[PDB]
Design a protein around this ligand. Sequence first.
Ligand SMILES: Cc1nn(-c2ccc(C(N)=O)c(N[C@H]3CC[C@H](O)CC3)c2)c2cccc(-c3cnc4ccccc4c3)c12
Length: 207
Amino acid sequence: METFAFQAEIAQLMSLIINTFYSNKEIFLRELISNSSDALDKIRYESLTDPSKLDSGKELHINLIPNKQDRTLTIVDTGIGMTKADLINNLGTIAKSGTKAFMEALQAGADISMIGQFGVGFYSAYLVAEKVTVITKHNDDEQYAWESSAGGSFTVRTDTGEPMGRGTKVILHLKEDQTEYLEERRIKEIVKKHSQFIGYPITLFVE
Ligand SMILES: Cc1nn(-c2ccc(C(N)=O)c(N[C@H]3CC[C@H](O)CC3)c2)c2cccc(-c3cnc4ccccc4c3)c12
């Protein structure tokens, strides 16, 4: 496991999100599903030039998996996935400029729900989660785990869990007062409102 520090302003935004009183927290799910959809778009588009891109798995889907025992909600997709370089460097570059623009907009009166426009919708996870674990497999790299509790640092390690073939799992370790997002009716309500026209099948697992 390697440990990395966030730059000051990303750290500020993550703190803002994880701490703030904002009642409309359900928008986290729309943002993560949008990320999954974007990932699925990218691998599908690549496969149009090179069909072998799908040797690591043909199915293009999104699963939502609640676990009441672990107090986790996991968003699983079979999109393009992320390399080590994505997890440490490339997404850090995107996050830096996106954070800068979002924070400016917030100063000017924009709402937290607008976060996804700035390309940092991922951070909305911290509205409902104390810790976020990202397990990912990209065609060009090994399986990795990225993890952060939004306290100024994140970690990256090779992941020894079940091989995924290709794609991403975003595991939300939910805050104690945010367990409604484990409930079937609640998740279904949110998906219908915010994510009903996503171009990939979304399966809501139950327990
Ligand atoms: C920022 C971020 N987002 N995120 C995410 C999630 C799901 C998917 C998914 N479901 O695939 C996804 N996919 C995209 C990958 C890149 C492709 O170009 C387009 C699809 C993107 C992360 C996942 C893990 C980590 C980070 C992160 C955030 N802050 C940092 C700040 C500094 C340094 C590194 C940082 C890394 C991110």
